[PDB]
Design a protein around this ligand. Sequence first.
Ligand SMILES: Cc1cc2c(cc1C)N(C[C@H](O)[C@H](O)[C@H](O)COP(=O)(O)OP(=O)(O)OC[C@H]1O[C@@H](n3cnc4c(N)ncnc43)[C@H](O)[C@@H]1O)c1[nH]c(=O)[nH]c(=O)c1N2
Ligand SMILES: NC(=O)c1ccc[n+]([C@@H]2O[C@H](COP(=O)([O-])OP(=O)(O)OC[C@H]3O[C@@H](n4cnc5c(N)ncnc54)[C@H](O)[C@@H]3O)[C@@H](O)[C@H]2O)c1
Ligand SMILES: N[C@@H](CCC=O)C(=O)O
Ligand SMILES: [Mg+2]
Ligand SMILES: [Mg+2]
Lengths: 1210, 112, 56
Amino acid sequence: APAPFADFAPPVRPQSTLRRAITAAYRRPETECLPPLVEAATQSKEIRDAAASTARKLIEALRGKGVEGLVQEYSLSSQEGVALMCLAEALLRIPDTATRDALIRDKIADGNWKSHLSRSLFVNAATWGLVVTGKLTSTVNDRSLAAALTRLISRCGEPVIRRGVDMAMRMMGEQFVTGETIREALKRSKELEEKGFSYSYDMLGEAATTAADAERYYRDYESAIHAIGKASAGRGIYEGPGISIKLSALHPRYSRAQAARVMGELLPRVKALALLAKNYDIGLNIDAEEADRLELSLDLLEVLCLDGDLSGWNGMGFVVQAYGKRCPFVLDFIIDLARRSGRRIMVRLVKGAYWDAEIKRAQLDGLADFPVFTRKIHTDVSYIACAAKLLAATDVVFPQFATHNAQTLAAIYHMAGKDFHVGKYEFQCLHGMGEPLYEEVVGRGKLDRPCRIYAPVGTHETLLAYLVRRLLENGANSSFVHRINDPKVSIDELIADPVEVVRAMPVVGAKHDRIALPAELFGDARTNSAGLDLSNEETLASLTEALRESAAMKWTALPQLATGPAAGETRTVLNPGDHRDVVGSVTETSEEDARRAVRLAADAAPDWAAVPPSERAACLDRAAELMQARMPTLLGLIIREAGKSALNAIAEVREAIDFLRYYAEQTRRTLGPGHGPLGPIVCISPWNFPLAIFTGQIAAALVAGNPVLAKPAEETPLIAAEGVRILREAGIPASALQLLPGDGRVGAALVAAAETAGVMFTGSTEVARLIQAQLADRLSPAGRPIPLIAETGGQNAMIVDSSALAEQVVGDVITSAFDSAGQRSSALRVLCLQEDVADRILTMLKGALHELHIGRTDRLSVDVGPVITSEAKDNIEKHIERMRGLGRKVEQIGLASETGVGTFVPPTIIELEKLSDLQREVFGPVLHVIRYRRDDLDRLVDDVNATGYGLTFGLHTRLDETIAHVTSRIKAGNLYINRNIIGAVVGVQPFGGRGLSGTGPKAGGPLYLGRLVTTAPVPPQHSSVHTDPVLLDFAKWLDGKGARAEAEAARNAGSSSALGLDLELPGPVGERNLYTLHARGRILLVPATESGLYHQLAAALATGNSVAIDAASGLQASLKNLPQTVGLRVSWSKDWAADGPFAGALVEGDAERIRAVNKAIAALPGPLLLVQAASSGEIARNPDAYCLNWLVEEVSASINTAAAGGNASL
Amino acid sequence: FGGRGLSGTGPKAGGPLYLGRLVTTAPVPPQHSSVHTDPVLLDFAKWLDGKGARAEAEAARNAGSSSALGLDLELPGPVGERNLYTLHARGRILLVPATESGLYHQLAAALA
Amino acid sequence: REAIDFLRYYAEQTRRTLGPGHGPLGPIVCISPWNFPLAIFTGQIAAALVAGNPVL
Ligand SMILES: Cc1cc2c(cc1C)N(C[C@H](O)[C@H](O)[C@H](O)COP(=O)(O)OP(=O)(O)OC[C@H]1O[C@@H](n3cnc4c(N)ncnc43)[C@H](O)[C@@H]1O)c1[nH]c(=O)[nH]c(=O)c1N2
Ligand SMILES: NC(=O)c1ccc[n+]([C@@H]2O[C@H](COP(=O)([O-])OP(=O)(O)OC[C@H]3O[C@@H](n4cnc5c(N)ncnc54)[C@H](O)[C@@H]3O)[C@@H](O)[C@H]2O)c1
Ligand SMILES: N[C@@H](CCC=O)C(=O)O
Ligand SMILES: [Mg+2]
Ligand SMILES: [Mg+2]
């Protein structure tokens, strides 16, 4: 029985001094990195002057020697130019020239191009937009482009189409690639090889998603090596061509977390390719990728350079990125490795290609700092400093200075001095981009320094995949190539020496003023939680020890009453991944003590309510500091008690910290003496986020001034007990926070207790409905319903159309469906694939499914852990077997024998014929897949809505018309565009749904605390300038009927309503996070008096809703002669259960009438209804008798604006 | 410039729809498109689909896409002013059909 | 100024839109008011003309 965490994340090899110096610099503050780089990059005044002169000469030559020309000839707008290139791209998909030329001449030119061209013409328009305009738009306005294409064809006809086709053919066949195939690329390289250039070929292709795709990339590299080696014909590694490879192409799980697989499976493949490169004596360069792959790649480089089978060949090459803070230390390591191995490693120094993505990832992950610089000039200094280090080691490495920056080039040219021979070092550039500059460098007439051209090879399709990222290295406002074209930029500015510019700044190395450190994402509002970097070996080593220490601790959970711990029945808590691993002991609460706890809470309520809100919020902030400091220990407990992976446990602790700090800040923004607490609040939480959801509900209740009875899920009491311990340590009094471990009976006993003033429930819809029924019997002492927040299940869909990028879709689907073994309320349950792309995506998804490692979660290499109990496993497996029995195709990963000691369900994909094949939420790792024809998209959205759930929803498309359509028609609380549908972040994606998925208000949102006080405050930013027009028509009708006071109240409701609020919430770069307030739907109105009905109708209409009015009220004659606009929103209901689902209810009556109606409402099928009740006298006295906060629906939408390949804003 | 009701038929003088009224087949004006699809049009198209009125359902979806309803543009002008141009529904359209298919096409155009 | 602007605006709109399949209606009668006796006069006529129609 393996000891906990004994094999958590052992490194590939013991970390040498040189390796640890690399790791130490991973996230070093920018002000610490720059001073030594400035020192190393300094050159003499004579050299600086000579370099400036050379750089000026080069820039002058560049400025004194396509799409623009076409746009000019035909007077095309930008959209017309983009649309034309999209059309040319589509036309070039037609393989035969004569067939294409006839379609153009007889059909496309002669009008309806739509008629003749399952995929939008405009799927790649973001790329063509970059070509035409130099600007990147994340999504495509396909209606604008369709209009522009019709306009340009109808205006200019076949000639413009001809020119567009020829232009696109040249760009895609000759400019963006050296050739479509390696043979074609080789044939086209002869011309510049005769002029003194060399080549390194890049077979466009990165990121294998499946074993089969990695195998295809391997055979593509192997075949390219043969062709390059044959062509090289003994020219050797310096004069002759080489190949560049990306390691992520060669294995579908190239990551530190899968290091053992990488060394066991990827390394041999690289070795095989290297052996072939050695036999032909060509270069083989390992390209550099994301920052979290840098150190892993060094382990492969070390093994290859020490492998005797590769001896005698100096062609092994390796890229280092100067924008990275580790660059100089990586170079020290490589130079030393070259010395030890005797291999003259070819070192390609680049600035770096992933900058935008690195900024976003570090922000998302809450890490201490960025692994790259944030000011471009810093990268330039780093590049020059690293060049100095390389030029001092030309006996042991071969430096390759890959840059198009003439100032960088000139600085290095003079740095290297007058002694040169081929093989000492070289420059490099990209095909189709750098030849203008390097034709001023290569040859005896110029600077007589060689340049190797990096030559992309691939078909149009492969080309377009990552062409945006390629372009951005030269369109950004910071890019040299962009500046050298800007006539507003002088040569003097271009030849400015970055070393001296940085030296003379006030703070050397200061972070970019406009990029927030991850901790500062929310500015002055609150401190972002901090995560942990599972690619950092120091972090892994420290975490290994803390995790082991956490498993030695004697975790317990006890009934913690106001008077002290209570006795109860005690049992062990077992690790779901291995029942032999006892995590702790829980003592469960008797029903008697649960009732006693509520009485103690009631008697302590005044003392807690009297703690000022700012001091209550200070307790939450202190608790957040404590959880942040304790995160490693908390991780270990969550991993073992709840079966979570480390990555997911980190995110969970972060979320708990974020809840605490968010509700503390919301309190500081809102709560005052008139926002009185409800009283004792029962907080019932689910097992699956046993710290974060548990903490969030309790923290909210507490900071609003209510004492809390915390009832954690029976599966996960230990982390709950630790969260309560932390909150108490932070200053929450024991009387204000009591912990009552146990099962649903303890929850039910708490709900039923007379002094319970409010219930916060997160869990299954079915249990919420039992709680709703129990509360329907109850009124507060004031005669009003006991507030219930019930956040429940989902049946979450993602719709994918033919414009989406399969690899992105698969990654987001795998994460959304199978992260946490699907045990997230937000998890993807139904993937909907447009018919034309379904087979290809499904094949890739199945391939990716089989790369997942399922097992006990105390190993970093585990992707998917167990399900929480044998009962959950049995429930999920019954569903799978029923589906399989109906003949549905079922794909499942095979589980290792070691899973037998726990309760595991393999990730499973089930192909359904119709969405109706699914009945209720299956809370496990089970993805259902349906296919749809594009014309049936609207009906599909209907089908998604028809389940009655409304939690998370995803859409993958590049097309704005589809975004607008689907997002306007879907009815769900959390929407996600071009990203996964999980991991909603507090205050950024306020989380919670509608229908069967929740009552709201959303946790982690601004309306939440207001539900936990008797008088809701006005939340921050909560207002709308928009007035519902039906409300206005109703107010006019009231005035016409002589209901003057009611008409005034209706106008007031129209103004007070926040319907139409539309906000962007601060968050990470590369995402737009929106928060909007919409109508809830159809509100059930149960009036008693005419004036009550008018107030109810005003409240509902002002918040955009329709209504169903109780026909038993007898008030039909009070609504005679309604304007048709209002009548369309009004129905009368005799049988409420037939006319739903409703989305809320408004009730007027005395206490016993309210209780009776509340019981009738609870009995309605379907969603829990948020009911508000008032007496006729309260309606007369209190304009807010019905609070408009609870008559709107919150919607959060998160759009990945980097999905097109990069981040335009940055 | 131009109005509705008793003030005019449109299209507006000095605006992008004007020239299209003076030719037998109107061109697509500059910037004249919308990403929004009328939801009632979409419901109509689904109803037509249910009936097997396949050609009409297709014409309805195409009208839904080609409609510029919802266009919302800022026009270039002087500083210190924001000049906006938007396309809205006209109101209630009188439909004078002869045939069922004609009616479905007319409804599609009007709803879109 | 408005007359100049109509002329230049309808010219540009023509350059952005009109091709061989946008045939003219034929003779267009342009009836104008007294109160903008050059601007509205010119605008209606210019548009009709540039769309390919002779004007009365
Ligand atoms: C032959 C060859 C081969 C490769 C590469 C280039 C060449 C020529 N690249 C791409 C390379 O990393 C880089 O993006 C481009 O070459 C552009 O850099 P230049 O020095 O020519 O331009 P320039 O002098 O304009 O520098 C642009 C670069 O500055 C950096 N930058 C921009 N804004 C910044 C900011 N705010 N803060 C900090 N830094 C900022 C970025 O690195 C950006 O690419 C690469 N890249 C890679 O990562 N891995 C690889 O394997 C390769 N392979
Ligand atoms: N919408 C959300 O934010 C959200 C978040 C997490 C989980 N969930 C949902 O929670 C479910 C999984 O969590 P779970 O399995 O712990 O849920 P559950 O419904 O099984 O149990 C939830 C909690 O309610 C308690 N409980 C059970 N029966 C009760 C009763 N009769 N009276 C009072 N309390 C009772 C349990 O002890 C537990 O504390 C899923 O359906 C998931 O979708 C929703
Ligand atoms: N808010 C969580 C869902 C709660 C889990 O069940 C998420 O978005 O992953
Ligand atoms: Mg349960
Ligand atoms: Mg019910």
